[PDB]
């Protein structure tokens, strides 16, 4: 219990089955997973202590946290992934489903909104029927990259009187963001009104996604044949850029950096090239992955994953490091017995040429395991160290 | 949990008719989240599944051995020879409506293990009970009727 | 333990198909792929049922009572 | 252990009626029927047939939570048409469509020689 | 009740861009030079190719719960092939005379440059877009 | 052919022969 | 594996030849040439970490013995056999792993910690732990009703006897977003 | 069953291999910055048998 | 002839391949559901174990006995004990089957679906006979025995549906497909290069005309025409899984009208 | 692609 | 099997005996180690 | 351990699992847990009637 929010007050709902059930948007303040996590419930006994729980520490109150003057709860996982999907220019809904998606909003005024498209076929937009969950008087404006008032890319966000005019709804809008749709709905309409909105957004989006569906497979790690050719080449040219420096230093022509050994200088350049390399290779896959790429789709909504995840799985894992430096000669002048002595090559000092899709070599596998283990230890050590820091 | 550090508990149990399905009539035994893959980078889980599908269809015992000459493009060629979309996706229909999901699901067999922590062995509640002799405070543990 | 009565996924009875599967392999010298299919185990859910079964009962029986 | 009885899925309880017709306040000529010990099988089917009625202005259904086999069906109709009648008709229409399907599958099977 | 804008346009360019079912149009007015038009269209239902000639209409009619047109015959301004419904969200003064209006039709945007339709186009939610040919 | 080079697939015939003799708890027993 | 310059014929080749391989398989099919036979025939040697410091090992035999005088794009990017000084060859790189990680399918296609986690979970698993489980009177025991061998296994699992005493079932899995449960 | 364990008063016991640094080994180490000693040559001399 | 039509492609004892046309998807799907979920069957539901020397646990065996298929042709003649009037069970509401097996052979002795014996009086209706489908006429292999290994138990088979336990499932997987050429754009094919080359063609692609590139997208289009294949477990013959499916769904809708009527009394 | 166990049939038909 | 191939490195602490040494190649499993207090101190034989 | 912290009565613990059909501020309590944990409500004219039903 590191937070004010690691203990919040909830409304009981007696249910069947042996698990405590919680709303997914309250997952974040608790720092709970369903990876088998258990939680404690404490029942107050005084009319007075209940009042304390309800009036001071109930979930809706705890929504906008004073830790960062921003909300500590937002839309997550399925609902975050599906909200981007629903709120696209391309996404349209036929009447049959519009009527179900309306009914699902428990507050819904009973008014069927006039469809964005009328004459060819009555079709509603994602944006449209999601704005049924957004309350009146909610006014938000945000500009991304190159968003204009005629938002060409479906960039930014423009909600007027609680109606989406333009922009895809993703992490920056419906997340636990500083200028959030949540941050605004709380400050403007009440913590209660806001807690309702969590549910409403969920109920709609979740329903729409239940029927649209979402998946991921090995196909989503697979990058284009020519894009792979381009990566293999990028890695190759970087390896040569490394050798050129390796021979330059062996010929005593390499001049040391101010306040750095010739060795310190050489190693700096090497690891800088081999990183520049991993980054470029990854950026090639990232660009080449279509908008239909399920990994890209999760990265886009902001639901899960980032560039490095794509980079490592699809293109190149990159240089492995322990104690700030490339795998050191644990053996006399060699990283493994499988190499010759005084081998400073990318291959010897732990650069993982391969992607996760391609699979690591035995050497790559071990050097990865070496750096990997350093992670697990450092984590273990930090969990301890931070524990005491919090208490003191 | 799968053999890829992919642990998890059940949320709900759905019967065959509520479950999504292949036009073939096949239905999943498990539904794991797409989100549990990018952050984790358990590519081998995906490959396990691709190879396992081929193995079941062909009456083989797929080689998931580490430093092999086996590739995803190789396995895929075999799966398409068996009449399936090479990368394991399959067109699925929603159980409630019968309507095709706009999405194609990565459907295939995967070896899951039953782990030793059952909920009904963990669940615990107390509202007054045994107290320690010395401290006169609640005792410890589910077994001991602890607080 | 012993050949499950019916496929978990679709419920097609695979209870009868054991001894017959084993005879197709042994006596008919067929491969598992054609054996499963001859017994008419069409979807892979049913195939994994028989194909991947471990008949441990045979080991247990080896103990005295 | 906290598992409800399996038959609770389809057998009505103590003083449970299949239908609970409550009127919708938010809209005129609108109603909300709560079907007990029922699921999507019946819901989606009725909802869909109701959409075929020109006099039906709104029709939707929802299984509010999976743990419970019950659903809410909201029906709104044009003036002077009782949503109850809209449902009565939608049902008759389904039965008659099924009867046709039975007598025609029977027809085709009685034509087959296997 | 009635119309606020009517003009025939010539499609200069049609653009999808990462969009499968929608395209952003560019068209100049046949009649008035000072007039220009940018509009997102559901090309699945109403396809438009560059060099097409289209009549574009803005009307205040033909709160209110949308009724399905199950109503056999009704008096819509249904003498057009593709119809949309949106909200006016921006009123831009680009120069003296020259003024632009922004319309969102459930995310499908539109910007219309001109000068004369002053005593017509309002910051009115009520705005039906109607297109023929 | 009798003394021809070995394939990587041959490794497993040696690995199979290793455990066939040693077992998986060789260390505990030998000690 | 011991690699010597040995036979005048060609380059530096591995002491073990296709002959010994079948000679071993004769004894394997029998259930006379054992592991001890390779050891006393001096084709195989025992090397600790201190000795490892004086040798030079090849990873694969074939992919690390001749020399250059097309390539599959799908395959992983391998290094070279440029060393003419090979003293020993690895029997199989997958032998770097131990019991736990040997049950992991394609661990070379996973992030290193994810393998460390699955190494820990296989202990928290369930299945037949012994066939005499009925006869034993253990403080606690769990037997999976219908254990299935895995559809994807490692060449290593044969020795782990996993296919005989499994710890799971082959579930038909869909990676999908469904009800949000 | 593989053996390699003991049956003590009924329960199966595993003697976990205990790691130690090898004896009779000459090892030279550099001493920390404030030490009045620069380097040390250490030998853990003990009778193997 | 009248309303929604059927055109049977192939038929066997275990499978019906057919084309359901002039139906609404919801109807086709609800029929699909009903077939799995709510058609009643007879299945062993109570197992009273007299003696067991088997390597197999009392309840392990009890569970297999549940999944064994039993004749459910005249399952309408049987009552649900739930609503029968007897203390526990009777002949009107249950089938009693005895299973007695002993390892007489020096070799392994098998226990099968064929070894079940009906002890109850069937009142002359086709019910409770264990379904045998194999060549050798043994049925399901319940379990194996050594020498002294004995197994004496009594079974009470009762009327039930799959919503209570999937043991009362009269059907295995139901094949279901519509719009093989994705003309309705009800799915958005994932691809790398070409959606057509990558995604295999349906069998039913034959039974429907392709759309042709030149033709625009038909938004008016609605899904009717569903290629289906019902597979029976053996309890009820395939035709009756479809017919009883239609009837069960009918009775279900009917019950709502009836319920709506009792309501309009008060 | 898969693991070859039919080496009993192969070694019997070759030796 | 895993338990009968286990190793304990008595220490004491956070430092270098926890990391996977180059020399551990093909003697000790690079992946199998517990998380936390015994991370890298409890090794597992290849 | 005994004063800044205490093991306490009227407390429960089980595995958690998320639900899209609960409101943000709700918590699903398993019946068994609800059946163990109690609230001491005082018999007053407002609840006297309800309370006699719960006791019944
Ligand atoms: Mg956790
Ligand atoms: Zn099956
Ligand atoms: Zn009776």
Tell me the CA end-to-end span of chain I in Å, nearest whole number.
41
Q: Which one of the ligands is nearest to C40 CA?
A: 2
The answer to whether E64 faces chain D, any CB pair under 8 Å, is no
| Pairwise CA distance, residues A156 & A145, whole Å | 8
| Pairwise CA distance, residues D112 & D101, whole Å | 16
Exposed (0-12), middle (13-18) or buried (19+): which is D37, by Cβ within 10 Å?
Answer: middle
Contact criterion met (CB below 8 Å) for E131 and E83: yes
Q: Do B95 and D40 touch (CB under 8 A)?
A: yes
Count other Cβ atoms within 10 Å, centred on residue B55: 32
Closest CA to E115 of E102, E99, E101, E126: E99
- Structural domains of chain D, with CATH: 1-114 (3.30.1360.10)
Read out DSSP for F1-31?
-TTPPPPGGGHHHHHHHHHHHH-SSHHHHH-
The CA-based angle A218-A223-A225, given to 5 degrees, is: 125
The answer to whether C27 faces chain I, any CB pair under 8 Å, is no
Distance from CA of G174 to the nearest CA of J (A): 22
| Pairwise CA distance, residues C19 & J9, whole Å | 21
Contact criterion met (CB below 8 Å) for A211 and B101: yes
Specify the long-range contacts of residues E111-116, CB closer than 8 Å, at least 24 apart. E111/A149, E111/A150, E111/E37, E111/E38, E111/E39, E112/E5, E112/E35, E112/E36, E112/E37, E112/E38, E113/E34, E113/E35, E113/E36, E113/E37, E114/E29, E114/E32, E114/E34, E114/E35, E114/E36, E115/E34, E115/E35, E116/E32
The answer to whether H16 faces chain F, any CB pair under 8 Å, is no
Return the CATH number of the domain spanning residue range I41-166.
2.170.120.12
Beta-carbon contacts of residue L14 (< 8 Å; ≥ 6 apart): A18, A19, A20, A38, A39, B119, B122, B123, B124, L30, L33
Beta-carbon neighbours within 5 Å of ion ligand 2: C 7, 9-10, 12, 45-46
Q: What is the 3-state secondary structure (H, E, C) of B98-116?
A: CCEEEEEEEEEEEEECCCC
Task: Spell out which residues of chain D touch residue E72, defining contact as CB-CB under 8 Å.
Answer: 54
Judging contact as 3 or more Cβ pairs under 8 Å, the answer for F and H is yes
Best of C45, C48, C52 to substitute, by most chain G Cβ atoms within 10 angstroms, is C52
Q: Output the six-digit token pair for A354.
A: 């391969």
| Pairwise CA distance, residues B6 & A34, whole Å | 12
In degrees and rounded to multiples of 5, residue A210 shows phi and psi of: -55, -40
D80: left (phi over 0), alpha (psi -120 to 50) or beta: left
Beta bridge partners of D60: D74
The DSSP secondary-structure symbol of A315 reads I
The answer to whether B5 faces chain A, any CB pair under 8 Å, is no
Report H helices in G7-148.
18-29, 35-40, 49-52, 99-102, 112-121
Judged by CB atoms within 8 Å, which residues 2-21 of K form the interface with A? 14, 18-21
| Pairwise CA distance, residues E76 & E63, whole Å | 18
Contact criterion met (CB below 8 Å) for A65 and A5: yes
Report H helices in G90-160.
99-102, 112-121, 157-160
Count other Cβ atoms within 10 Å, centred on residue L45: 6
Q: Output the six-digit token pair for A171.
A: 């992490």
| Pairwise CA distance, residues B89 & E38, whole Å | 39
In degrees and rounded to multiples of 5, residue L27 shows phi and psi of: -140, 120
Beta-carbon contacts of residue K35 (< 8 Å; ≥ 6 apart): A376, A379, A380, G116, G117, G120
Distances (CA, A) of I120 to A133, I45, I156: 61, 15, 9
Count other Cβ atoms within 10 Å, centred on residue I66: 19
Do β-strands I94-102 and I15-21 pair in parallel, antiparallel, or remain unpaired?
Answer: unpaired
The DSSP secondary-structure symbol of A114 reads P
| Pairwise CA distance, residues G89 & G111, whole Å | 27
Which residue is listed with tokens 């023929």? E132
Distances (CA, A) of B94 to A293, B22, B31, B67, B100: 21, 10, 13, 40, 6
Count other Cβ atoms within 10 Å, centred on residue K9: 15
Distance from CA of G77 to the nearest CA of A (A): 6
Length of chain C: 65
The DSSP secondary-structure symbol of G95 reads G
CA dihedral A85, A87, A91, A97 (to 10 degrees): 90
| C37 labeled part of a ligand binding site | no
Do β-strands G169-177 and B30-32 pair in parallel, antiparallel, or remain unpaired?
Answer: parallel
Judging contact as 3 or more Cβ pairs under 8 Å, the answer for B and A is yes
Beta-carbon contacts of residue A132 (< 8 Å; ≥ 6 apart): A101, A102, A105, A108, A113, A204
Taking each helix axis from N to C terminus, what angle separates C44-51 and B43-58, rounded to the nearest 10 degrees?
Answer: 80
Q: Output the six-digit token pair for A222.
A: 């697979």
Closest CA to A6 of A37, A48, A46: A37
In three-state secondary structure terms, L6 is coil
Range A71-212 has CATH code 3.50.50.60:
no
Tell me the CA end-to-end span of chain H in Å, nearest whole number.
33
Please identify, in words, the CATH class of the domain defined by I1-40+167-266: alpha beta
Secondary element (H or E) of residue E82: strand E82-85
Tell me the CA end-to-end span of chain C in Å, nearest whole number.
18
Closest CA to G96 of G59, G45, G69: G59
Distance from CA of A371 to the nearest CA of G (A): 8
| Pairwise CA distance, residues A57 & A7, whole Å | 8
Contact criterion met (CB below 8 Å) for A28 and A72: yes
Radius of gyration of chain G (CA): 22
In three-state secondary structure terms, C34 is helix
Count other Cβ atoms within 10 Å, centred on residue F30: 9
Contact criterion met (CB below 8 Å) for E88 and E22: no
| Pairwise CA distance, residues E34 & E27, whole Å | 12
Which residue is listed with tokens 């428990």? A106
The partner residue sitting opposite L26, judged by closest CB among A13, A73, A202, is A13
Q: What is the 3-state secondary structure (H, E, C) of chain I?
A: CCCCEEEEEEECCCEEEEEEECCCHHHHHHHHHHHHHCCCEEEEEEEEEEEECCCCCHHHHHHHHHHCCECCCCCCCCCCHHHCCCCCCCCCCEEEEEEEEECCCCCCEEEEHHHCEECCCCCCCCCCCECCCCCCCCCCEEEEECCCCEEEEEEEEEEECCCCCHHHCCEEEEEEEECCCCCCCCCCCCCCCCHHHHCCCCHHHCCCCCCCCCCCCCCCCCCCCEEEEEEECCCCCHHHHHHHHHHHHHHHHHHHHHHHHHHCCC
D104: left (phi over 0), alpha (psi -120 to 50) or beta: alpha
The answer to whether C10 faces chain G, any CB pair under 8 Å, is no
| Pairwise CA distance, residues A57 & A73, whole Å | 15
Contact criterion met (CB below 8 Å) for L16 and A19: yes
Contact criterion met (CB below 8 Å) for A77 and A24: yes
Distance from CA of A255 to the nearest CA of G (A): 30
| Pairwise CA distance, residues A155 & D79, whole Å | 44
Best of A24, A365, A377, A380 to substitute, by most chain G Cβ atoms within 10 angstroms, is A365
| Pairwise CA distance, residues I220 & B117, whole Å | 53
Number of domains in chain E: 1
Q: Output the six-digit token pair for D67.
A: 């743990």
Closest CA to A316 of A232, A198, A243, A195: A232
Length of chain A: 392
Q: Do G29 and J3 touch (CB under 8 A)?
A: no
Do β-strands D30-36 and D70-77 pair in parallel, antiparallel, or remain unpaired?
Answer: antiparallel
Task: Spell out which residues of chain G touch residue L18, defining contact as CB-CB under 8 Å.
Answer: 181
Count other Cβ atoms within 10 Å, centred on residue A60: 21
Handedness of CA J2, J3, J9, J10 (dihedral sign): positive
Q: Do D1 and L21 touch (CB under 8 A)?
A: no
The DSSP secondary-structure symbol of H39 reads E
Distance of CA I211 to the CA centre of its chain: 37
Q: What are the domain boundaries of chain I?
A: 1-40+167-266, 41-166
CA dihedral I56, I62, I66, I72 (to 10 degrees): 110
Task: Spell out which residues of chain A touch residue E66, defining contact as CB-CB under 8 Å.
Answer: 112-115, 122
Closest CA to I224 of I73, I5, I69, I8: I5
Beta-carbon contacts of residue L29 (< 8 Å; ≥ 6 apart): A12, A13, A14, A15, A20, A41, L12
Count other Cβ atoms within 10 Å, centred on residue L40: 8
| Pairwise CA distance, residues D86 & D91, whole Å | 9
Closest CA to E120 of E30, E60, E56, E54: E60
CATH number at residue C60: 1.10.10.60
Contact criterion met (CB below 8 Å) for A202 and A78: no
Judged by CB atoms within 8 Å, which residues 128-147 of B form the interface with A? none
For chain E, the chains sharing at least 3 beta-carbon pairs closer than 8 angstroms are: A, D, I
| C44 labeled part of a ligand binding site | no
The answer to whether E49 faces chain I, any CB pair under 8 Å, is no
Q: How far is the CA of C47 from the centre of ligand 2 (A)?
A: 7
Contact criterion met (CB below 8 Å) for B31 and C21: no
Report H helices in A11-76.
27-30, 47-56, 59-62
Distances (CA, A) of I114 to B39, C22, I98, I137, I233: 54, 20, 11, 7, 16
The CA-based angle G146-G148-G150, given to 5 degrees, is: 160
Do β-strands I109-112 and I171-178 pair in parallel, antiparallel, or remain unpaired?
Answer: unpaired
Q: Do I190 and A222 touch (CB under 8 A)?
A: no
Q: Do J2 and B74 touch (CB under 8 A)?
A: no
| Pairwise CA distance, residues I192 & E26, whole Å | 31
* Maximum alpha-carbon separation in chain H: 58
Helices (H) and strands (E) in chain E, counts: 0, 9
Contact criterion met (CB below 8 Å) for G32 and F24: no
CATH number at residue E86: 2.40.50.140
Q: Do B72 and A295 touch (CB under 8 A)?
A: no
The partner residue sitting opposite G146, judged by closest CB among C4, C45, C60, is C4
Taking each helix axis from N to C terminus, what angle separates D40-51 and D83-109, rounded to the nearest 10 degrees?
Answer: 110
Within 13 Å and on the Cβ side, how many CA atoms surround G143?
Answer: 18
Handedness of CA G100, G103, G106, G109 (dihedral sign): negative
Beta-carbon contacts of residue B63 (< 8 Å; ≥ 6 apart): B51, B70, G152, G153, G154, G155, J1, J2, J3
Closest CA to I64 of I171, I172, I167, I169: I167
Q: How far is the CA of I88 from the centre of ligand 3 (A)?
A: 7
| Pairwise CA distance, residues A309 & A299, whole Å | 9
Judging contact as 3 or more Cβ pairs under 8 Å, the answer for D and I is yes
The CA-based angle F18-F22-F27, given to 5 degrees, is: 130
Beta-carbon contacts of residue A16 (< 8 Å; ≥ 6 apart): D2, D3, D4, D67, L30, L31
In three-state secondary structure terms, B48 is helix
């Amino acid at each position: 219990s590191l937070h004010k929010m690691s203990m919040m007050a909830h409304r009981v709902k007696v249910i069947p089955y042996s698990t405590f059930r919680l709303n997914l948007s309250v997952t974040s303040p608790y720092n709970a997973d369903f990876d088998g996590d258990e939680m404690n419930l404490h029942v107050p006994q005084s009319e007075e202590t209940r009042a304390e729980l309800s009036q001071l520490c109930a979930v809706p109150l705890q929504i906008v946290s004073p830790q960062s003057n921003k909300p500590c709860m937002g839309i997550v996982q399925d609902t975050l992934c599906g909200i981007r999907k629903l709120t696209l220019r391309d996404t349209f809904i036929e009447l049959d489903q519009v009527l179900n998606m309306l009914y699902w909003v428990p507050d819904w005024d009973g008014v069927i909104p006039t469809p964005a498209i009328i004459k060819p076929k009555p079709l509603w937009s994602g944006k449209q029927i999601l704005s049924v969950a957004i309350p009146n008087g909610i006014h938000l404006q945000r500009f991304d990259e190159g968003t204009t008032l005629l938002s060409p890319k479906d960039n930014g966000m423009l909600i007027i009187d609680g109606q989406i005019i333009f922009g895809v709804v993703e992490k920056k809008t419906v997340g636990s963001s500083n200028g959030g749709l949540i941050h605004v709905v709380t400050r403007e309409k009440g913590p209660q009104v806001c807690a309702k909105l969590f549910g409403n957004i969920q109920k709609v989006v979740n329903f729409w996604l239940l029927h649209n569906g979402f998946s991921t497979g090995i196909g989503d790690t697979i990058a284009d044949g020519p894009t792979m050719r381009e990566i293999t080449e990028t890695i190759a040219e970087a390896k040569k850029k490394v050798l050129d420096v390796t021979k330059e230093a062996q010929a005593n022509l390499l001049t040391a950096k101010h306040g750095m050994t010739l060795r310190e200088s050489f190693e700096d350049n090497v690891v800088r090239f081999l990183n520049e390399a991993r980054d470029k290779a990854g950026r090639l896959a990232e660009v080449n992955l279509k908008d239909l790429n399920n990994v890209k789709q999760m990265v886009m909504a902001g639901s899960k994953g980032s560039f490095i995840n794509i980079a490592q799985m699809s293109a190149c894992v990159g240089q492995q490091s322990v104690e700030g430096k490339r795998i050191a000669f644990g053996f006399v002048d060699r990283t493994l017995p499988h190499f010759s002595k005084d081998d400073y090559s990318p291959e010897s000092k732990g650069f993982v040429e391969n992607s996760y899709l391609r699979g690591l070599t035995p050497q790559e596998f071990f050097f990865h395991a070496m750096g990997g283990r350093e992670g697990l230890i450092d984590t273990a050590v930090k969990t301890a160290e931070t524990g005491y820091i919090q208490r003191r | 949990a799968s053999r890829h550090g992919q642990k998890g508990t059940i949320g709900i149990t759905y019967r065959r008719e509520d479950m999504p399905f292949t036009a073939e009539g096949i239905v999943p035994d498990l539904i794991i989240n797409p989100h549990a893959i990018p952050s984790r980078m358990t590519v081998a889980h995906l490959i396990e599944c691709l190879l396992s599908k081929v193995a079941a269809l062909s009456g083989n015992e797929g080689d998931a051995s580490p430093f092999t000459d086996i590739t995803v493009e190789g396995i895929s060629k075999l799966l398409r020879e068996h009449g399936y979309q090479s990368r394991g996706f399959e067109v699925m229909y929603n159980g409630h409506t019968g309507k095709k999901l706009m999405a194609q699901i990565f459907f295939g067999p995967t070896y899951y293990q039953r782990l030793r922590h059952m909920v009904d062995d963990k669940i615990h509640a107390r509202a007054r009970g045994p107290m320690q002799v010395l401290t006169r405070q609640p005792v410890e543990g589910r077994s001991r009727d602890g607080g | 333990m012993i050949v499950p009565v019916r496929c978990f996924s679709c419920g097609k009875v695979v209870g009868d198909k054991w001894e017959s599967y084993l005879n197709l392999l042994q006596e008919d010298e067929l491969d598992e792929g054609t054996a499963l299919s001859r017994l008419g185990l069409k979807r892979y859910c049913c195939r994994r049922m028989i194909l991947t079964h471990v008949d441990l009962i045979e080991k247990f029986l080896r103990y005295n009572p | 252990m906290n598992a409800p009885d399996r038959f609770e899925l389809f057998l009505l309880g103590e003083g449970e009626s299949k239908l609970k017709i409550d009127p919708d306040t938010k809209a005129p000529n609108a109603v909300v029927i709560t079907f007990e010990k029922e699921d999507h099988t019946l819901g989606n089917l009725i909802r869909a047939e109701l959409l075929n009625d020109r006099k039906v202005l709104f029709a939707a259904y929802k299984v509010e939570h999976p743990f419970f086999a019950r659903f809410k069906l909201r029906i709104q109709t044009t003036e002077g048409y009782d949503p109850k009648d809209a449902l009565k008709n939608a049902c008759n229409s389904i039965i008659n469509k099924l009867g046709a399907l039975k007598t025609n599958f029977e027809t085709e099977w009685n034509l087959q020689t296997l | 009740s009635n119309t606020l804008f009517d003009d025939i346009f010539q499609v200069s360019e049609v653009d999808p861009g990462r969009y499968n079912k929608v395209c952003r149009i560019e068209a100049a007015s046949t009649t008035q030079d000072q007039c220009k038009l940018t509009l997102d269209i559901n090309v699945e239902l109403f396809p438009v190719a560059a060099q097409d000639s289209l009549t574009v209409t803005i009307a205040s009619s033909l709160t209110r719960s949308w009724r399905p047109p199950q109503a056999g015959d009704r008096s819509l301004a249904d003498d057009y092939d593709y119809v949309m419904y949106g909200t006016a969200y921006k009123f831009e003064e680009v120069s003296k005379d020259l003024i632009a209006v922004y319309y969102s039709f459930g995310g499908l945007l539109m910007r219309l440059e001109g000068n004369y339709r002053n005593l017509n186009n309002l910051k009115q939610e009520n705005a039906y877009l109607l297109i023929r040919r | 052919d009798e003394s021809a080079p070995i394939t990587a697939e041959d490794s497993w015939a040696v690995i199979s022969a290793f455990f066939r003799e040693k077992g998986l708890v060789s260390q505990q027993l030998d000690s | 594996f011991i690699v010597e310059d040995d036979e005048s014929l060609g380059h530096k080749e591995l002491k073990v030849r296709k002959g010994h391989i079948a000679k071993l398989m004769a004894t394997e099919y029998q259930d006379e040439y054992t592991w001890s036979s390779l050891l006393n025939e001096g084709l195989v040697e025992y090397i600790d970490a201190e000795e490892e410091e004086s040798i030079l090992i090849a990873m694969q035999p074939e992919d690390l013995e001749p020399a250059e005088a097309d390539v599959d794009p799908a395959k992983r990017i391998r290094v070279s056999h440029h060393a003419t000084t090979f003293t020993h060859c690895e029997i199989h790189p997958s032998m770097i792993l131990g019991v736990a990680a040997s049950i992991i399918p394609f661990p070379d296609h996973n992030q290193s910690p994810r393998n460390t986690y699955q190494s820990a979970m296989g202990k928290q698993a369930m299945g037949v732990f012994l066939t005499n489980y009925n006869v034993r009177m253990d403080t606690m025991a769990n037997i999976l009703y219908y254990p299935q061998k895995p559809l994807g296994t490692t060449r290593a699992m044969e020795y782990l006897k996993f296919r005989e005493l499994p710890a799971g079932q082959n579930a038909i899995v869909a990676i999908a977003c469904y009800s949000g449960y | 069953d593989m053996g390699g364990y003991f049956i003590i008063n009924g329960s199966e016991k595993v003697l976990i291999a205990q790691e130690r640094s090898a004896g009779n080994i000459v090892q030279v180490f550099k001493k920390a910055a404030p030490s009045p000693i620069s380097h040390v040559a250490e030998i853990r001399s003990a009778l193997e048998k | 002839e009248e309303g929604p039509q059927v055109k049977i492609r192939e038929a066997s004892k275990d499978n019906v391949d057919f084309i359901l046309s002039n139906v609404d998807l919801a109807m086709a799907n609800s029929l699909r559901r009903v077939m799995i979920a709510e058609i009643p069957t007879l299945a062993i539901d109570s197992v009273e174990v007299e003696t067991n020397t088997t390597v197999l646990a009392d309840e392990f065996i009890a569970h297999r006995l549940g999944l064994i298929p039993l004749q459910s042709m005249d399952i309408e003649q049987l009552e649900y004990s739930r609503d029968c009037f007897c203390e526990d069970h009777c002949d009107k509401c249950s089938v009693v089957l005895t299973l007695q097996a002993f390892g007489e052979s020096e070799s392994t002795t098998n226990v099968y679906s064929k070894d079940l014996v009906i002890v109850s009086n069937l009142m002359g209706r086709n019910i409770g006979h264990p379904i045998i489908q194999d060549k050798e006429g043994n049925g399901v292999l319940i379990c194996k025995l050594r020498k002294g290994q004995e197994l004496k138990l009594t079974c009470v088979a009762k009327k039930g549906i799959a919503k209570e336990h999937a043991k009362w499932g009269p059907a295995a997987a139901i094949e279901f497909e519509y719009d093989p050429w994705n003309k309705l754009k009800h799915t958005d094919y994932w691809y790398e290069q070409d959606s057509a080359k990558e995604w295999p063609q349906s069998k039913n692609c034959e039974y429907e005309d392709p759309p042709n590139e030149g033709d625009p997208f038909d938004y008016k289009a609605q899904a009717d025409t569903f290629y289906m294949n019902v597979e029976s477990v053996g309890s009820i013959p395939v035709d009756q899984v479809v017919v009883r499916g239609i009837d069960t769904l009918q009775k279900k809708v009917a019950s709502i009208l009836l319920a709506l009527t009792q309501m309009d009394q008060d | 692609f898969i693991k070859r166990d039919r080496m009993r049939r192969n070694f019997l038909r070759m030796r | 099997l895993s338990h009968l191939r286990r190793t304990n490195t008595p220490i004491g602490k956070l430092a270098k005996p926890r990391q996977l040494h180059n020399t551990h190649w093909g003697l000790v499993c690079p992946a199998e180690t517990p998380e936390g207090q015994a991370c890298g101190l409890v090794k597992n034989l290849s | 351990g005994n004063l800044m912290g205490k093991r306490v009565d009227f407390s429960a613990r089980t595995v958690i699992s998320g639900d899209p059909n609960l409101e943000l501020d709700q918590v699903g309590v398993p019946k068994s847990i609800a059946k163990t944990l109690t609230y001491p409500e005082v018999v007053t004219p407002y609840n006297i009637d309800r309370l006699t039903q719960l006791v019944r």
